[PDB]
């Protein structure tokens, strides 16, 4: 079969190509935030550096689903966009905390051993603080959550204000469906979102 089929190997966009490829998507994405339009390139680096750093830390060896690629960056950007487009003006602080979120749900939600997930978190900040010095560190403070079942648009929510809510909205799920008294605890919340 191959005799008639010419092959063409395709690896991952060289670290340089990614900063120019995905780097652009951002420089155009930061127009929805003129005030932060001076961090476009910054957002990029932190995005590509984190991705790269992780792709290596988590190889297909330690586990199968530990596969990465630029596709993660797009899901990351589209995520940054979709979120921004619904905010009456963002801030350097908001960007970082919103940046870390998408990074988590992309490179952490797949991890298994707490040791790995723990690593992912300390690295996410190491890179964030390394590219965003003017940040208000507390902007990366855990736990990082984002819900819209409370705030008008896509805004951060604290465990309490959220669980105290889901718990109530849950009271309906009881008589309207299966009466399974669920104990809204840490993990549970991270999942429902």
């Amino acid at each position: 079969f191959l005799r008639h089929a010419p092959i063409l190997l395709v690896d991952f966009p060289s670290t340089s190509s990614l900063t120019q490829i995905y780097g652009t998507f951002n420089r155009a994405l930061m127009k929805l935030l003129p005030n932060l339009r001076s961090f476009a390139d910054n957002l990029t680096d932190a995005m590509v550096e984190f991705y790269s750093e992780s792709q290596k830390r988590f190889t297909p060896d330690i586990q199968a689903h530990y596969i990465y690629s630029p596709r993660e960056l797009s899901r990351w950007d589209r995520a940054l966009l979709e979120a921004i487009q619904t905010m009456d003006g963002c801030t350097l602080e908001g960007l970082v905390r919103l940046w870390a979120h998408e990074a988590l749900r992309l490179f952490q939600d797949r991890l298994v051993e707490t040791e790995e997930k723990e690593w992912t978190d300390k690295k996410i900040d190491e890179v964030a603080l390394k590219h965003f010095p003017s940040v208000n560190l507390d902007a990366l403070k855990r736990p990082i959550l984002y819900s819209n079942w409370l705030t008008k648009d896509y805004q951060p929510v604290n465990r309490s204000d959220l669980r105290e809510y889901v718990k109530a909205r849950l009271k309906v799920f009881y008589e309207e469906e299966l009466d399974v008294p669920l104990v809204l605890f840490n993990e549970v919340l991270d999942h429902i979102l």
Binding site: R3, P6, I7, L9, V10, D11, T24, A28, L29, R78
Partner: protein, 141 residues
């Protein structure tokens, strides 16, 4: 090219076809290149440069297309040293270069960009780069 390791078992005909398919595209390129410049057709002297160079081009992509990213580079340099005809210095892989259908010269690919706010990292929008515009030429043939 055979001694080199590929991602899929090296088979004489496979690479030659990939090569022939590419070497033929180089030819067709001149075939149509004249169906346009009827008043300014190709030229015996200049055409000689294109074909002679394009051949070397096809060799690396046709016989080295299935080669690794790093592996492919070394291969292109091997084709340079040998190539008796004009070829750049080994300081830059021949893989990074192409060939102008016009002045038929080893013009680095690097010489060949705006996205719209609402359509950022989206399916279609394919930010053009070296690799991008480079693989295209090969996929065309």
């Amino acid at each position: 090219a055979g001694q080199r390791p590929h991602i899929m078992d090296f088979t004489r005909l496979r690479v030659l076809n990939s090569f022939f398919s590419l070497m033929n595209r180089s030819i067709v390129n001149v075939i149509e290149y004249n169906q346009l410049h009827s008043d300014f057709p190709m030229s015996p002297e200049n055409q000689s440069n294109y074909i002679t160079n394009r051949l070397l081009y096809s060799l690396m992509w046709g016989l080295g297309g299935s080669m690794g990213l790093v592996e492919r580079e070394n291969f292109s340099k091997f084709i340079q040293t040998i190539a008796i005809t004009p070829v750049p210095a080994n300081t830059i892989p021949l893989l990074d270069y192409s060939v102008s259908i016009d002045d038929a010269n080893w013009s680095l690919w690097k010489n060949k960009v705006e996205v719209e706010t609402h359509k950022v990292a989206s399916p279609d929008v394919v930010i053009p780069t070296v690799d991008t515009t480079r693989h295209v030429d090969v996929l065309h043939a």
